[PDB]
Coordinates of N, CA, C and O in Angstrom, one line a residue:
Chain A
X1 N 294.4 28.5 110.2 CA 294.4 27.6 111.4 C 293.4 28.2 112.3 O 292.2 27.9 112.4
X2 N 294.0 29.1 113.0 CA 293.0 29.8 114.3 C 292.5 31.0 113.2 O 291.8 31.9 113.6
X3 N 292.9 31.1 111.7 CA 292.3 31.8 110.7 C 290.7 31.0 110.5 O 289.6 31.4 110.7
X4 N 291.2 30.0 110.1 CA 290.2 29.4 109.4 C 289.3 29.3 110.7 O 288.1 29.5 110.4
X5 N 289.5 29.2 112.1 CA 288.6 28.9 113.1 C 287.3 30.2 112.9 O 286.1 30.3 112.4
X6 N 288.3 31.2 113.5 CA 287.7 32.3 113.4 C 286.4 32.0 112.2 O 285.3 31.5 112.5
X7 N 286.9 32.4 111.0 CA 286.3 32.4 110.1 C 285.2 31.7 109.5 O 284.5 32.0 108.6
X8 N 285.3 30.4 110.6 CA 283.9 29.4 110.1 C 282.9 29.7 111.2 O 281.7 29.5 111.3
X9 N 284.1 30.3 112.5 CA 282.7 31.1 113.6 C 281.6 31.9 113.3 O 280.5 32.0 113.8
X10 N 282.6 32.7 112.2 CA 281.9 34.1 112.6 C 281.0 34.1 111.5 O 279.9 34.6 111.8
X11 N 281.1 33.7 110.4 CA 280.0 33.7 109.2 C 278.9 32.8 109.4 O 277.7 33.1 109.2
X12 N 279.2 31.5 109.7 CA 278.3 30.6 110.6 C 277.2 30.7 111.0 O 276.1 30.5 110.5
X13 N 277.8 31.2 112.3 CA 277.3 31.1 113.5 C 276.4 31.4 113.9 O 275.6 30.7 114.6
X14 N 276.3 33.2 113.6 CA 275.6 34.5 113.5 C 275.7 34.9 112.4 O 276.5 34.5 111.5
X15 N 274.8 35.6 112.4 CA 274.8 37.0 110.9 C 273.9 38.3 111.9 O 273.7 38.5 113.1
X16 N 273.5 38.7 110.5 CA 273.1 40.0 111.1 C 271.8 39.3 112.0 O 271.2 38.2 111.8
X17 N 271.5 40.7 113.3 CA 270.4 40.5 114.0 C 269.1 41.2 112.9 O 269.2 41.7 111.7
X18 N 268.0 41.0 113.7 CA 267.0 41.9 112.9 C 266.9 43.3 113.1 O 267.5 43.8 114.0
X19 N 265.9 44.0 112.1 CA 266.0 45.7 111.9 C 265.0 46.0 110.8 O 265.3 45.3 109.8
X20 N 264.1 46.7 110.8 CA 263.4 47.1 110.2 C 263.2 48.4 109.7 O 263.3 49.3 110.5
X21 N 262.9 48.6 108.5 CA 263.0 49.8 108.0 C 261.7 50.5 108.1 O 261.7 51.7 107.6
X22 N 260.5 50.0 108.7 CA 260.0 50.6 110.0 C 260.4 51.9 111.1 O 260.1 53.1 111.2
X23 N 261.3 50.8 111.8 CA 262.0 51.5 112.7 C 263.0 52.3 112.3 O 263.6 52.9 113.2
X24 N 263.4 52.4 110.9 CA 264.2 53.3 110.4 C 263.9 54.9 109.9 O 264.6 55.7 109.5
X25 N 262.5 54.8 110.1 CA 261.5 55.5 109.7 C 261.2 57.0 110.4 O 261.0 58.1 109.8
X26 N 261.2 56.7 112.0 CA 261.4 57.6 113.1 C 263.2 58.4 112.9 O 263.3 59.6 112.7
X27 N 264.0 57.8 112.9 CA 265.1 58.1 112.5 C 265.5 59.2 112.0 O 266.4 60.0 112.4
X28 N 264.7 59.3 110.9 CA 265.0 59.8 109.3 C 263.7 60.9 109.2 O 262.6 60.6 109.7
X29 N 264.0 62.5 108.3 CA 262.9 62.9 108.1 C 262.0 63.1 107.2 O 262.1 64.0 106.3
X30 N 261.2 62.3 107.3 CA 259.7 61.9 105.8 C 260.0 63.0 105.2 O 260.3 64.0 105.7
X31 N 259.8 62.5 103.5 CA 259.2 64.0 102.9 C 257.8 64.1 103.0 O 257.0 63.1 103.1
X32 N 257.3 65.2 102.9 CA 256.6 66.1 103.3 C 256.0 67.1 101.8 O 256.8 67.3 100.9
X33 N 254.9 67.6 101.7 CA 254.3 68.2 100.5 C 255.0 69.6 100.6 O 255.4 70.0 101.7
X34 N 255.1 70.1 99.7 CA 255.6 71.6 99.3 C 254.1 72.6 99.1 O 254.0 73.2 98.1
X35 N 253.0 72.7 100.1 CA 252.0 72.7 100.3 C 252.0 74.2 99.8 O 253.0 74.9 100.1
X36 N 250.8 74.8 99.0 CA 250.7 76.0 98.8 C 250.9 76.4 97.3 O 252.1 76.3 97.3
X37 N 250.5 76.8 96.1 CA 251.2 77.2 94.7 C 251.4 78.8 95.4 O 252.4 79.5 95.0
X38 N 250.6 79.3 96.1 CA 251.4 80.6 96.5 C 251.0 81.3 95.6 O 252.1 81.9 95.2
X39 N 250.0 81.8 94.9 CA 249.3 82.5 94.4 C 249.5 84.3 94.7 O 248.8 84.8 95.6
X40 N 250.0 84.8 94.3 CA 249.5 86.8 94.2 C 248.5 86.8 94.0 O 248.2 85.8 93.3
X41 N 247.5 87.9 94.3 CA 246.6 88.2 94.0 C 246.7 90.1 93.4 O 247.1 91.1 94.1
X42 N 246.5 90.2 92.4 CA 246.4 91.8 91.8 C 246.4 92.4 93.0 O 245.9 92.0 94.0
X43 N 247.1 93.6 92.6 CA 247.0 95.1 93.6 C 246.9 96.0 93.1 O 247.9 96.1 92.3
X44 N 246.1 97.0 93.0 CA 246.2 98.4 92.4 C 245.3 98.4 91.4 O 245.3 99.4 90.6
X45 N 244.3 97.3 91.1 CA 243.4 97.1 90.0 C 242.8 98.3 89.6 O 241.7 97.8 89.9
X46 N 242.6 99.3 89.3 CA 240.9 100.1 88.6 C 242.2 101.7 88.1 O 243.4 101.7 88.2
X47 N 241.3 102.5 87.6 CA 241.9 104.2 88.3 C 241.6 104.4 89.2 O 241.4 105.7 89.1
X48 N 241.1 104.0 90.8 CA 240.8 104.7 91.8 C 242.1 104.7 92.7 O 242.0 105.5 93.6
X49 N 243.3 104.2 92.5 CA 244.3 104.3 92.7 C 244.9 105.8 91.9 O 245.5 106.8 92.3
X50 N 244.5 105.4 91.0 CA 244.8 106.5 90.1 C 244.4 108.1 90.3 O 245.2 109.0 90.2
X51 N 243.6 108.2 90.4 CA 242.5 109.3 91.1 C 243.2 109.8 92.3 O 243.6 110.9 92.5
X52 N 243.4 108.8 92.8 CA 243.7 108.5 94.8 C 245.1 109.3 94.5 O 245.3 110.4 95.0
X53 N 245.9 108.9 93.8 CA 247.4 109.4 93.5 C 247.7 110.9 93.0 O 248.6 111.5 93.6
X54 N 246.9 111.4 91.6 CA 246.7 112.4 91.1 C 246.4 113.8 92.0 O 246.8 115.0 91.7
X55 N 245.5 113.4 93.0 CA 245.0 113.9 93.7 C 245.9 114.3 94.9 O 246.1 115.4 95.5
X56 N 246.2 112.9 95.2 CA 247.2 112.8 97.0 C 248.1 113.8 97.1 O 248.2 114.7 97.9
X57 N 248.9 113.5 96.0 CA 250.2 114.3 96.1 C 250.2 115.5 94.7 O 250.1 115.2 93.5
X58 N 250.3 116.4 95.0 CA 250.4 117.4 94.2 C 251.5 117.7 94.1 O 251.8 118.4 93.1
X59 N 252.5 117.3 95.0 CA 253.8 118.1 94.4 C 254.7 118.2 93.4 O 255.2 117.2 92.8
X60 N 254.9 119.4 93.2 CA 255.2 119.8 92.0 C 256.8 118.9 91.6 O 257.3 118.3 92.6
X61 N 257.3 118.8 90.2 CA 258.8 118.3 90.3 C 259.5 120.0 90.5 O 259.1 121.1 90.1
X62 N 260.3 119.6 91.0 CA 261.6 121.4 90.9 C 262.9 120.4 90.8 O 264.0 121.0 90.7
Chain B
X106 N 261.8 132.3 84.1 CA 260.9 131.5 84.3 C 261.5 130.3 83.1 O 261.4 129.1 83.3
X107 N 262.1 131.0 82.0 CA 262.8 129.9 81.0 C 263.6 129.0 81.6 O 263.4 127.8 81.2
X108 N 264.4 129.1 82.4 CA 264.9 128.1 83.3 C 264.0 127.1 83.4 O 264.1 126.1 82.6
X109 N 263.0 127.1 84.3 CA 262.1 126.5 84.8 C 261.3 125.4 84.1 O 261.2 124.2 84.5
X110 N 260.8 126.1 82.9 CA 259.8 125.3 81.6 C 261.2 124.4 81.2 O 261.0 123.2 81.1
X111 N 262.5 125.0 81.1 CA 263.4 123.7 80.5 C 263.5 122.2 81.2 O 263.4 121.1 80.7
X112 N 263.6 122.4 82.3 CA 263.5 120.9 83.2 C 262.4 120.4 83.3 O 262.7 119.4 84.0
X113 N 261.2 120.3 83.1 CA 260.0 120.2 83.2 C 259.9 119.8 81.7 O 259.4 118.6 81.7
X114 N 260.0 120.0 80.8 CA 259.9 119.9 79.7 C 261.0 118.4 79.4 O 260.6 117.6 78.6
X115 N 262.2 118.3 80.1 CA 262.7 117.4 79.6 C 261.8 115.8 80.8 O 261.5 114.7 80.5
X116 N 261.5 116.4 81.8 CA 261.0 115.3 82.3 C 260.0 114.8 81.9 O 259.9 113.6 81.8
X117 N 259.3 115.4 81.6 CA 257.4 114.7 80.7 C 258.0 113.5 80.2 O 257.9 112.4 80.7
X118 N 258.4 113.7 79.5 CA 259.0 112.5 78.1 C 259.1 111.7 79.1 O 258.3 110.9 79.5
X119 N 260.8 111.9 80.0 CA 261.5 110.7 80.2 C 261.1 110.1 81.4 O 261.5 109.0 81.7
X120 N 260.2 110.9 82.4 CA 259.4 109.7 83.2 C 258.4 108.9 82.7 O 258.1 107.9 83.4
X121 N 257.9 108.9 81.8 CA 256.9 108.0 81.3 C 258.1 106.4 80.9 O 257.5 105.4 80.5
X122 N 259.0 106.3 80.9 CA 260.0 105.8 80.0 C 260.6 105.0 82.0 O 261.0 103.8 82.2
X123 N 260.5 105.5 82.6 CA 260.7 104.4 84.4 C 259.5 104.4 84.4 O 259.0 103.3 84.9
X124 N 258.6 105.2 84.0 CA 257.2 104.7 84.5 C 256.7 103.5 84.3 O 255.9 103.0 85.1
X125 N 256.9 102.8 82.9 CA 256.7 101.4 82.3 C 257.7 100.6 82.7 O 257.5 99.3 82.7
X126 N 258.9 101.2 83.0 CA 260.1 100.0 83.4 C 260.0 99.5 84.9 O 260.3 98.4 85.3
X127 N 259.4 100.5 85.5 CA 259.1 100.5 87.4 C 258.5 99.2 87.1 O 259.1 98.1 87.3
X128 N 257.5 99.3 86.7 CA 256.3 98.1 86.4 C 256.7 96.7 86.0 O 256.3 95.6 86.5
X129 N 257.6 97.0 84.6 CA 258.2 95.8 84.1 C 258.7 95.2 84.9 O 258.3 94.0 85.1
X130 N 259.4 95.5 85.5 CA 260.8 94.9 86.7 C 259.4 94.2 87.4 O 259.0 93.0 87.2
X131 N 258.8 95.1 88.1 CA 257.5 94.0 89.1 C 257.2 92.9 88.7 O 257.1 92.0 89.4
X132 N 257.1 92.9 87.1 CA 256.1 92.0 86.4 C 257.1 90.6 87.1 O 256.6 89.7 87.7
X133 N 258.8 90.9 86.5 CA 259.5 89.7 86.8 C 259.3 89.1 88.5 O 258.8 88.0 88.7
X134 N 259.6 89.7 89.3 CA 259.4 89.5 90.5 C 258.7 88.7 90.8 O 259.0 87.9 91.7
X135 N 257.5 88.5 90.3 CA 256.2 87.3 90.2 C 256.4 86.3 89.7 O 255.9 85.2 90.1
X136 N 257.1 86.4 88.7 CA 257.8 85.0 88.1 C 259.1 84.1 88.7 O 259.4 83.0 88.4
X137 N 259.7 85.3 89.7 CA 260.8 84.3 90.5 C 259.4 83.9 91.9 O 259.8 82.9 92.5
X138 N 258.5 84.3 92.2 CA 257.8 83.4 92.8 C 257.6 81.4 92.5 O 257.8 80.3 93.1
X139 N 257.3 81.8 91.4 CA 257.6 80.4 90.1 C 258.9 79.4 90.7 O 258.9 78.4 91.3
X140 N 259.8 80.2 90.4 CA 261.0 79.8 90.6 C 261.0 79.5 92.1 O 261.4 78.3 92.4
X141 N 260.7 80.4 92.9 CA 261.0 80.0 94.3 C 260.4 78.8 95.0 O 260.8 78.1 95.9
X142 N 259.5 78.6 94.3 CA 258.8 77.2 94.8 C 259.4 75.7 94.1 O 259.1 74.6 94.4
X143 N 260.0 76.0 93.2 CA 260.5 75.2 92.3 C 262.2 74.9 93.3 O 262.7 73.8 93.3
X144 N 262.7 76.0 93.9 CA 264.0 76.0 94.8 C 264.0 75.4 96.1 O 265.0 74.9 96.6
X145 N 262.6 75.6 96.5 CA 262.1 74.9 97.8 C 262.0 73.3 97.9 O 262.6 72.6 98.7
X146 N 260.9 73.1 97.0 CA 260.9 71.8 96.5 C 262.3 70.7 96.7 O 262.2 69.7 97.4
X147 N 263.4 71.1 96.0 CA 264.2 70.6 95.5 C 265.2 70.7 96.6 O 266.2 69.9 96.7
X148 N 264.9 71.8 97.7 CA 266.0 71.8 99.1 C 265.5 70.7 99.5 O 266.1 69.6 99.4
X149 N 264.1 70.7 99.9 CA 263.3 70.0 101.1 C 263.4 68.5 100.4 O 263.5 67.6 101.3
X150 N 263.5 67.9 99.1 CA 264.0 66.7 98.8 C 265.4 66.4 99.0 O 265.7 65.3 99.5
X151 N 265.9 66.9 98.8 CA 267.4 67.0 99.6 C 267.8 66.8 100.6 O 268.7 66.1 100.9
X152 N 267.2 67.5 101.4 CA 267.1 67.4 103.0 C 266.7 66.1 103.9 O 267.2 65.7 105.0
X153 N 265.4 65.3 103.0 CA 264.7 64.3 103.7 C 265.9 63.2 103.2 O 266.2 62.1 103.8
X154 N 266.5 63.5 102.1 CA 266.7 62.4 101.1 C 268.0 62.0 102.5 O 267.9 61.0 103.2
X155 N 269.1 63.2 102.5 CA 269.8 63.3 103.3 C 270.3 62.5 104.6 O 271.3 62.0 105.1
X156 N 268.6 62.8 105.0 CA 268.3 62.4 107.0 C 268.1 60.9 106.5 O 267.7 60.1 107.4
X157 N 268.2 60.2 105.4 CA 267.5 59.2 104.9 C 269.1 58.2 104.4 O 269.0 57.1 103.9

């Protein structure tokens, strides 16, 4: 009765307003690149490390 | 002095034996670099997916 009223109002009448997924856009946060492979680069390359060490530290083991 | 030559004698050997493992271990270390970008990745999609 005042069921059915309702019910032929509200689906009717109106529906949804507008919205854009645009504007949904600010909201929310973009993905984004995983920028970089992040590369090492060698350390300690030659015997001049080697030399450098042999040399540095002489202390004996006891 | 016998004393002396005994401990020195056992170490020759068995530092050469961490000397290669010190290293080994490093080598992995480089390879969880791999991995860590692969962990990143996969937060930071998660995260946007999330806010989304």
């Amino acid at each position: 009765n005042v069921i059915q009223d309702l019910y032929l109002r509200e689906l009717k009448d109106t529906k949804l307003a507008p919205s854009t997924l645009q504007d949904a856009e600010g909201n929310v946060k973009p993905w984004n690149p995983p920028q970089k492979p992040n590369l090492p680069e060698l350390e300690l390359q030659g015997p001049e490390a080697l030399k450098a060490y042999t040399e540095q530290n002489v202390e004996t083991a006891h | 002095r016998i004393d002396s030559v005994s401990q020195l004698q056992n170490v020759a050997e068995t530092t050469k034996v961490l000397f290669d493992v010190s290293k080994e271990t490093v080598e992995l270390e480089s390879e969880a670099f791999e991995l860590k970008q692969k962990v990143e990745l996969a937060h930071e999609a998660k995260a946007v997916l999330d806010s989304w």
